[PDB]
Coordinates of N, CA and C and ligand atoms in Angstrom, one line a residue:
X4 N -116.7 201.9 149.0 CA -118.1 201.9 147.4 C -117.2 203.3 146.9
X5 N -116.7 203.2 146.0 CA -116.4 204.8 145.1 C -116.9 204.2 143.7
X6 N -117.9 205.3 142.8 CA -118.0 205.3 141.8 C -117.5 206.4 141.1
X7 N -117.7 205.6 139.4 CA -117.6 207.0 138.9 C -117.4 208.6 138.7
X8 N -116.8 209.4 138.5 CA -117.7 210.8 138.8 C -117.9 211.7 140.6
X9 N -117.0 210.1 141.2 CA -117.3 210.6 142.8 C -116.1 212.1 142.7
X10 N -116.2 212.3 144.0 CA -115.1 214.1 144.2 C -114.8 213.7 145.2
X11 N -113.6 214.5 145.6 CA -113.1 214.6 147.2 C -112.5 216.8 146.6
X12 N -112.6 216.3 147.6 CA -111.3 218.7 148.0 C -110.0 217.6 149.1
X13 N -109.1 217.9 148.7 CA -107.6 217.6 149.5 C -107.2 218.6 149.9
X14 N -106.1 218.8 150.8 CA -105.2 219.8 151.2 C -105.2 221.0 151.3
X15 N -107.1 221.3 151.9 CA -108.0 222.1 152.1 C -107.5 222.8 153.5
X16 N -106.8 221.5 154.5 CA -107.1 222.0 155.7 C -108.6 221.8 156.2
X17 N -109.5 222.9 156.1 CA -111.1 222.4 156.3 C -111.6 221.2 155.7
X18 N -112.4 220.7 155.8 CA -113.2 220.5 155.1 C -113.8 220.9 153.6
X19 N -114.2 221.7 154.0 CA -115.0 222.6 152.6 C -114.1 223.4 151.6
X20 N -112.4 223.5 151.7 CA -112.2 223.7 150.6 C -110.6 223.5 150.3
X21 N -110.5 223.0 149.0 CA -108.9 222.0 149.0 C -109.1 221.4 147.7
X22 N -108.3 221.0 146.8 CA -107.3 220.8 145.7 C -109.4 219.2 144.9
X23 N -109.7 219.4 143.9 CA -111.0 219.0 143.8 C -110.4 217.7 143.1
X24 N -110.4 216.6 143.4 CA -109.9 215.2 143.0 C -111.3 214.5 142.7
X25 N -111.1 213.8 141.4 CA -112.2 212.9 141.1 C -111.5 211.3 140.4
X26 N -112.8 210.7 140.3 CA -112.7 209.2 140.5 C -112.9 208.7 138.9
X27 N -111.9 207.8 138.6 CA -112.6 207.1 137.6 C -111.7 206.2 137.1
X28 N -112.5 204.7 136.6 CA -112.5 204.1 136.5 C -110.9 203.3 136.9
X29 N -111.5 203.4 138.9 CA -110.5 202.7 139.8 C -109.1 203.7 140.1
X30 N -109.3 204.7 140.1 CA -107.9 205.8 140.1 C -108.4 207.6 140.1
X31 N -108.0 208.1 140.7 CA -108.1 209.9 141.3 C -107.6 209.9 140.2
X32 N -107.7 211.6 140.2 CA -107.0 212.5 139.2 C -107.3 213.9 139.9
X33 N -106.9 215.1 138.9 CA -107.0 215.6 139.5 C -107.9 216.7 138.2
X34 N -108.4 218.0 138.3 CA -109.1 218.4 136.7 C -108.6 219.8 136.9
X35 N -107.8 220.2 135.7 CA -107.3 221.0 135.2 C -107.8 222.9 135.6
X36 N -107.0 223.2 135.5 CA -107.9 225.0 135.4 C -108.4 226.0 134.8
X37 N -108.1 225.1 133.3 CA -108.8 225.9 132.4 C -110.3 226.0 132.2
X38 N -110.8 227.5 131.7 CA -112.4 227.5 131.8 C -113.2 227.3 133.6
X39 N -112.3 226.8 134.6 CA -112.8 226.7 135.7 C -113.3 227.6 136.2
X40 N -115.0 228.6 136.9 CA -115.1 229.0 137.1 C -116.1 228.4 137.7
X41 N -117.0 229.9 138.1 CA -117.5 229.5 140.2 C -118.8 228.5 139.8
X42 N -119.5 228.9 138.6 CA -120.0 227.4 138.4 C -120.0 226.0 138.6
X43 N -119.1 226.1 138.1 CA -117.7 224.5 138.3 C -117.2 224.1 139.5
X44 N -117.0 224.9 140.5 CA -117.3 225.2 141.8 C -118.5 224.7 142.8
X45 N -119.4 225.6 142.3 CA -120.3 224.6 142.7 C -120.8 223.6 142.7
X46 N -121.0 222.8 141.4 CA -121.3 221.6 141.4 C -120.3 220.9 142.5
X47 N -119.1 220.5 142.5 CA -118.3 220.3 143.8 C -119.0 220.3 144.3
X48 N -119.1 221.9 145.2 CA -119.6 222.5 146.4 C -120.7 221.1 146.9
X49 N -122.3 221.6 146.5 CA -123.4 221.3 146.5 C -123.5 219.8 146.3
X50 N -122.3 218.5 145.5 CA -122.0 217.3 145.4 C -121.5 217.2 146.4
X51 N -120.2 217.9 147.2 CA -119.9 217.2 148.5 C -121.1 217.8 149.8
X52 N -122.0 218.0 149.5 CA -123.1 218.4 150.6 C -123.3 220.0 150.8
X53 N -122.1 220.5 150.2 CA -122.1 222.6 151.6 C -123.3 223.1 150.2
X54 N -123.7 224.3 150.8 CA -125.0 225.2 150.1 C -124.2 224.9 148.3
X55 N -123.4 226.6 148.7 CA -122.3 226.7 147.7 C -120.8 226.7 147.7
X56 N -120.5 226.9 146.0 CA -119.4 228.1 146.1 C -119.4 229.0 146.6
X57 N -118.1 230.0 147.3 CA -117.4 231.3 147.3 C -117.2 231.0 146.1
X58 N -115.7 230.5 146.3 CA -114.4 230.7 145.4 C -114.2 229.8 144.1
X59 N -113.8 229.7 143.3 CA -113.0 228.8 142.1 C -111.4 229.5 141.6
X60 N -110.9 227.7 142.2 CA -109.3 228.9 142.5 C -108.4 227.7 141.7
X61 N -107.4 228.3 140.6 CA -106.5 227.5 139.7 C -105.0 226.9 139.6
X62 N -104.5 227.3 139.0 CA -103.2 227.6 139.3 C -102.8 226.4 140.8
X63 N -102.9 225.7 141.1 CA -103.0 224.6 141.8 C -102.3 225.4 143.6
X64 N -103.5 226.5 143.8 CA -104.0 226.9 144.9 C -103.2 226.4 146.5
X65 N -103.8 224.6 145.9 CA -104.1 223.8 147.3 C -102.9 223.0 147.1
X66 N -102.2 223.0 146.2 CA -101.1 222.4 146.7 C -100.6 221.0 145.1
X67 N -100.0 221.0 144.1 CA -100.0 219.9 142.7 C -100.7 218.6 143.7
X68 N -101.2 218.1 142.8 CA -101.7 216.1 142.6 C -101.4 216.1 142.4
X69 N -101.2 214.7 142.5 CA -101.1 213.4 141.6 C -101.5 212.6 140.8
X70 N -101.3 212.0 140.2 CA -102.0 211.0 139.2 C -102.7 212.3 137.9
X71 N -103.2 211.2 137.0 CA -103.8 212.0 135.7 C -104.6 213.2 136.4
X72 N -104.7 214.0 135.2 CA -105.6 215.3 134.3 C -106.3 214.5 134.5
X73 N -107.5 214.4 135.2 CA -108.9 213.3 134.9 C -109.9 214.8 134.2
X74 N -110.0 215.9 134.2 CA -111.6 216.7 133.2 C -110.5 218.2 133.0
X75 N -110.5 218.7 131.6 CA -110.0 220.6 131.9 C -111.4 220.4 131.2
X76 N -111.2 221.9 131.2 CA -112.2 222.9 129.7 C -114.1 222.4 130.5
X77 N -113.9 222.5 132.3 CA -115.2 221.8 132.2 C -115.7 223.1 131.9
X78 N -117.2 222.7 131.6 CA -118.4 224.0 131.6 C -119.6 223.3 132.3
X79 N -119.6 223.7 133.3 CA -121.4 223.1 133.9 C -122.1 224.3 133.8
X80 N -123.0 223.9 133.8 CA -125.0 224.8 133.9 C -124.6 224.8 135.2
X81 N -124.8 224.1 135.7 CA -124.6 224.5 137.1 C -125.8 223.2 138.2
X82 N -126.3 222.6 137.0 CA -127.6 221.7 138.0 C -126.8 220.1 137.9
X83 N -125.6 220.1 137.7 CA -125.2 218.6 137.5 C -124.7 218.3 138.6
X84 N -124.9 216.3 138.5 CA -124.7 215.5 140.4 C -122.7 215.9 140.5
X85 N -122.8 215.9 138.9 CA -121.3 215.5 139.2 C -120.5 216.2 137.6
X86 N -119.0 216.8 138.1 CA -118.2 217.2 136.9 C -118.2 216.1 135.7
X87 N -118.7 215.1 136.3 CA -118.6 213.7 135.2 C -119.9 214.4 134.0
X88 N -120.7 214.7 134.5 CA -121.8 215.2 133.8 C -121.8 216.6 133.5
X89 N -120.9 216.8 133.2 CA -120.9 218.8 132.7 C -119.7 218.6 131.3
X90 N -120.2 219.3 130.6 CA -119.1 219.4 128.8 C -117.6 219.7 129.6
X91 N -117.2 218.8 128.8 CA -115.8 218.9 128.9 C -114.5 218.6 128.0
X92 N -113.6 218.3 127.7 CA -112.8 217.7 126.1 C -112.5 216.3 126.7
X93 N -113.2 215.5 127.8 CA -113.4 214.1 127.5 C -112.8 213.7 128.8
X94 N -112.6 212.9 129.5 CA -112.0 212.0 130.7 C -110.7 211.2 130.4
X95 N -110.0 211.6 130.5 CA -108.5 212.3 130.1 C -107.4 212.9 129.6
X96 N -109.0 213.8 128.7 CA -108.0 214.6 127.5 C -107.8 215.8 128.1
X97 N -106.2 216.0 128.5 CA -105.4 217.9 128.4 C -104.3 217.2 128.1
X98 N -103.4 218.5 128.1 CA -102.4 219.0 128.2 C -101.6 219.4 129.3
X99 N -102.5 220.2 130.3 CA -102.1 220.5 131.7 C -101.2 219.9 132.4
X100 N -100.8 220.4 132.8 CA -99.2 219.4 134.0 C -100.8 219.9 135.9
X101 N -100.0 219.2 136.5 CA -100.4 219.5 137.9 C -100.4 221.1 138.4
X102 N -99.5 221.6 138.3 CA -99.5 222.8 138.7 C -100.8 223.3 138.2
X103 N -101.8 223.5 137.2 CA -102.8 223.6 137.1 C -103.9 223.6 137.7
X104 N -103.7 222.7 138.8 CA -104.9 222.3 139.7 C -105.7 222.9 140.2
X105 N -106.5 222.5 139.8 CA -107.7 223.6 140.3 C -108.6 223.0 141.9
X106 N -109.3 224.1 142.3 CA -109.5 224.6 143.7 C -110.7 224.5 143.8
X107 N -111.3 224.8 144.8 CA -112.3 225.1 145.3 C -112.7 225.8 147.0
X108 N -113.3 226.2 146.8 CA -113.8 227.2 148.7 C -114.8 227.2 148.4
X109 N -115.7 226.1 149.7 CA -117.0 226.4 149.7 C -117.8 227.0 150.6
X110 N -119.5 227.0 151.4 CA -119.7 227.9 152.2 C -119.7 226.7 152.8
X111 N -119.5 227.2 154.8 CA -119.1 226.5 155.2 C -120.7 226.2 155.7
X112 N -121.9 226.7 155.8 CA -122.7 225.7 156.1 C -123.4 224.5 155.0
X113 N -123.6 223.6 155.1 CA -124.2 222.9 154.5 C -125.8 222.8 154.5
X118 N -110.6 235.5 135.5 CA -111.2 234.4 134.9 C -110.0 233.6 134.9
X119 N -110.5 232.4 135.3 CA -109.4 230.9 134.7 C -109.5 230.6 133.3
Ligands
NAG201 C1 -124.8 230.1 144.3 O1 -123.5 231.1 144.7 C2 -123.8 232.1 143.4 C3 -122.6 233.5 143.9 O2 -123.5 234.2 143.6 C4 -125.2 232.7 143.2 O3 -125.2 232.9 141.5 C5 -126.1 231.1 142.8 O4 -127.4 232.0 142.7 C6 -126.1 230.5 144.1 N1 -127.0 229.8 144.4 C7 -126.8 229.0 143.3 C8 -128.3 227.6 144.3 O5 -126.6 228.3 142.7

């Protein structure tokens, strides 16, 4: 049971870090690192149940993903439930390639 805006971290080794992947209308895709910051990273981490983000990484730090680039130039206030609720260029709007895939490092506790 997955809905639009649902997220997951991949290829991180641990469960509290990885490449950010997000669901939309039936498929998973990645997020471009343009303007990717710590406030954006904390929205992902808290949604996934961690206390906070410690690092917002870009340039496919956890490897390049596959699928469409879902979001780009994400500007969160920090109080959002999902990256889908943050300001961005809109779903599927991006000129980036997977080598720009954004990632995060969250707290163990449960610029670009
Ligand atoms: C999350 O971590 C950053 C790092 O300094 C901090 O500014 C922020 O207040 C922390 N907590 C929350 C709930 O955002």
